[PDB]
Write a protein that binds this ligand. Sequence first.
Ligand code: MG
Ligand code: MG
Ligand code: MG
Ligand code: MG
Ligand code: MG
Ligand code: MG
Ligand code: MG
Ligand code: MG
Ligand code: MG
Lengths: 70, 153, 107, 50
Amino acid sequence: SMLRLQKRLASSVLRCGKKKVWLDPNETNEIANANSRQQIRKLIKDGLIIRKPVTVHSRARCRKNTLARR
Amino acid sequence: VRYSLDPENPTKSCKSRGSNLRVHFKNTRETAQAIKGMHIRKATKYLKDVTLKKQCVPFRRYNGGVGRCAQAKQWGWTQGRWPKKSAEFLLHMLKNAESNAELKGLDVDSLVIEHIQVNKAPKMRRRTYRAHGRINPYMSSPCHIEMILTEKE
Amino acid sequence: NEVVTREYTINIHKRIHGVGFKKRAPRALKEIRKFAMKEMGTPDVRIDTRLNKAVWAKGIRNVPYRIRVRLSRKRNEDEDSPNKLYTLVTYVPVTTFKNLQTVNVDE
Amino acid sequence: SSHKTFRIKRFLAKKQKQNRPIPQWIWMKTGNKIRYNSKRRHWRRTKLGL
RNA sequence: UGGUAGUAGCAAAUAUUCAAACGAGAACUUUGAAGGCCGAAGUGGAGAAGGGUUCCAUGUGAACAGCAGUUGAACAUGGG
Ligand SMILES: [Mg+2]
Ligand SMILES: [Mg+2]
Ligand SMILES: [Mg+2]
Ligand SMILES: [Mg+2]
Ligand SMILES: [Mg+2]
Ligand SMILES: [Mg+2]
Ligand SMILES: [Mg+2]
Ligand SMILES: [Mg+2]
Ligand SMILES: [Mg+2]
């Protein structure tokens, strides 16, 4: 149904933006009836709310280039 | 209520009315004229073909501007379109008329449309914004639709 | 007889030759669906997400020229649409599209 | 403005309370011609002045 | 209230695709995946002036959001 409220609440609790918040696409009915920051923590512990890992930005190419610079 | 022309044989006739329908009058009138003399089942499949862009509605009176289509030749006309929501609205009206015939207790498979009429409803205004701080109306063109079906052999 | 599964290869390059850069990939999806509907008499065609990822692997303006697709006509589930059966398209990771006939797989 | 004065805030308070719709039981009166509240105010059409 | 006329147009800022869910109805809502943009003088996060309930939740889809909308800064209820 509607999950904007849950996504905003999950982002606020997780201290990260809604970009990295992963809501379970299977248990949408379970997620949709949370509507409270206290029980989304229960959902987080259950694992239905997971923060996606940070996008990789490796400096290995930069370090290899700087080795030739040195 | 009071219709335009009463059926000649009210015993075996069904009626349907729709007032203040948000659909273009010019499209509705010309898609009504095509199905004016059709059978009930033939009209319904014709409307479905119009919705699926398989059969076209020839634009005869409100003909200015609308381009040509290959399907118009079967109507003896050079211009046609496929107004889907106009077809859907009177398709619902045809279904409502069929329900009325079922309620009255008539043979559905023998219904031929005789009278169908489209009139202009009171326009409802909206606002559009033009250059130099000018305001012009954005009038809609709703229509009234009236239909009567009578059994035929 | 009707519940069948068969895999082909689609020449996306041939089927989208001449389309704009910002329209290649979306039209490639349309042509894949059109090809499935053309070769199997079923307007209901569903494209798997893995196939969607494979087509959009490079970009909107860059698509693989040939792609291997497993096309399966399956009996429809509940929520009865007018189409009594549906078609499913699955990507087939293949190293080389050479001397590959349109083989018919079996259960 | 978040630094509202007391008088302005009180004036806004009255306008907000005036902006509510007419109750549905009034138009059942005998000598009634009020089909709707014609003096409703919207924050995007009328700016209330001030 | 007509002809114009179902006409002009709905072309400033690269771009969407797939599957599912609610739903009677989905190019437009939500989720998940992919492909993108803003590229830290931002399409980010917070203020002053200004606006004054537009902030939050539920319900409706009568009217408006120049298509549509299951969406809204729309409407009705209660909070803050
Ligand atoms: Mg003319
Ligand atoms: Mg002309
Ligand atoms: Mg303008
Ligand atoms: Mg101006
Ligand atoms: Mg035009
Ligand atoms: Mg523009
Ligand atoms: Mg902010
Ligand atoms: Mg809001
Ligand atoms: Mg609209």
